[PDB]
């Protein structure tokens, strides 16, 4: 499409102008000597707006991909972030939101485009830095990019997502988020990242207050949690629980936040995702700790798990049966025949 080529050319030309400015701009001069390019003066927002709107259609995305659109839009977002930093300027915030939305659409279902954007490590660093923006709407857009990039990440993309500090940045972002729709995007990205490798799990667990926060996302008894929050927080917990099971300090954080009690409540949920997540978490936590095994026995876990072993869903069937096996292999003294007497 020639309008699309026309728009991408405009964006590329602006970026080039910005790079040439960055390379010529000398320290300690007047504001007037070598003026910064202003995207308003180059009609950039309306260009990226049109491309964002077009990016919702798969045929328009195909045309964009043939003309290098992902790279052009990414370079634009990056250069604006580098030039202007964490600004509250409405034009800049809007530009960044539209660019990020386009990048979300262009990385959806497209393994090649995910790999390409991850390879742009300078852009990736700029994206991660925007999670500290005062705009929770920009936070949501950035988290949505990172969510898509972390879904079906290839070996190199996983390494890069880790390298640029996306896990710590997202977890720290989560602790301060007030808007549910922003939190949903942030937790969905973390759910993907938490599955990539053990080091990502450790990085989540290492953020001060993060485990208590995550257990907080599980509760029904909340004026802020929605179903989506419970699902995604529980998914993160399921993934990181393989590590937590081996760390007494982290188990203690879970204990003191009533995690086992809440997971047993989750077994009774009508939500398949919630039950699934709880079965995987209990699989892990029911191993190798007598204190937690006894609490589970006291609260009736054995029967609650037995009821789920015939599920058609692998995670429920396997996780419930495995947690049950762990409890049956480690019967507390007070439930042994010789002690009930």
């Amino acid at each position: 499409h020639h309008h699309m080529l026309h728009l991408l050319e405009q964006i590329r030309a602006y970026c080039e102008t910005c790079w040439e400015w960055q390379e010529a701009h000398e320290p300690g001069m007047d504001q007037d000597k070598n003026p910064m390019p202003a995207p308003v003066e180059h009609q950039i927002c309306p260009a990226v707006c049109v491309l964002m709107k077009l990016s919702f259609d798969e045929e328009h995305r195909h045309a964009m991909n043939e003309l290098g659109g992902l790279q052009a839009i990414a370079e634009l977002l990056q250069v604006d972030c580098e030039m202007y930093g964490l600004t509250n300027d409405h034009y800049s915030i809007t530009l960044r939101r539209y660019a990020g939305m386009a990048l979300t659409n262009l990385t959806f279902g497209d393994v090649a485009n995910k790999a390409t954007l991850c390879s742009m490590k300078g852009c990736m660093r700029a994206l991660v830095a925007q999670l500290k923006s005062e705009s929770e709407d920009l936070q949501q857009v950035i988290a949505s990019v990172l969510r898509n990039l972390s879904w079906r990440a290839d070996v190199n993309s996983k390494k890069t997502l880790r390298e640029v500090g996306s896990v710590k940045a997202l977890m720290e972002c989560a602790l301060e988020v007030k808007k549910e729709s922003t939190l949903k995007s942030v937790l969905s990205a973390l759910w993907n990242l938490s599955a990539h490798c053990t080091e990502n799990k450790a990085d989540i667990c290492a953020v001060d207050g993060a485990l208590a926060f995550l257990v907080g996302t599980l509760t029904y008894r909340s004026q802020t949690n929605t179903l989506a929050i419970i699902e995604s927080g529980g998914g993160i917990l399921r993934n990181v629980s393989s590590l937590i099971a081996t760390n007494e300090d982290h188990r203690q954080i879970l204990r003191e936040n009533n995690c086992l009690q809440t997971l047993l409540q989750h077994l009774k949920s009508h939500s398949l995702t919630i039950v699934s997540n709880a079965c995987g978490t209990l699989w892990n936590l029911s191993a190798r700790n007598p204190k937690d095994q006894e609490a589970l026995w006291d609260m009736g876990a054995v029967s609650m798990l037995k009821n789920l072993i015939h599920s058609k869903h692998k995670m429920i069937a396997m996780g419930s049966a495995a947690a049950l096996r762990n409890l049956m292999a480690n019967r507390p003294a007070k439930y042994k025949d010789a002690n009930i007497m």
Binding site: F56, G100, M101, S144, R147, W151, R152, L187, S188, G235
Partner: peptide, 7 residues
């Protein structure tokens, strides 16, 4: 956590 279009 899956993937999604923008909004």
């Amino acid at each position: 956590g899956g993937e999604a279009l923008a909004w």
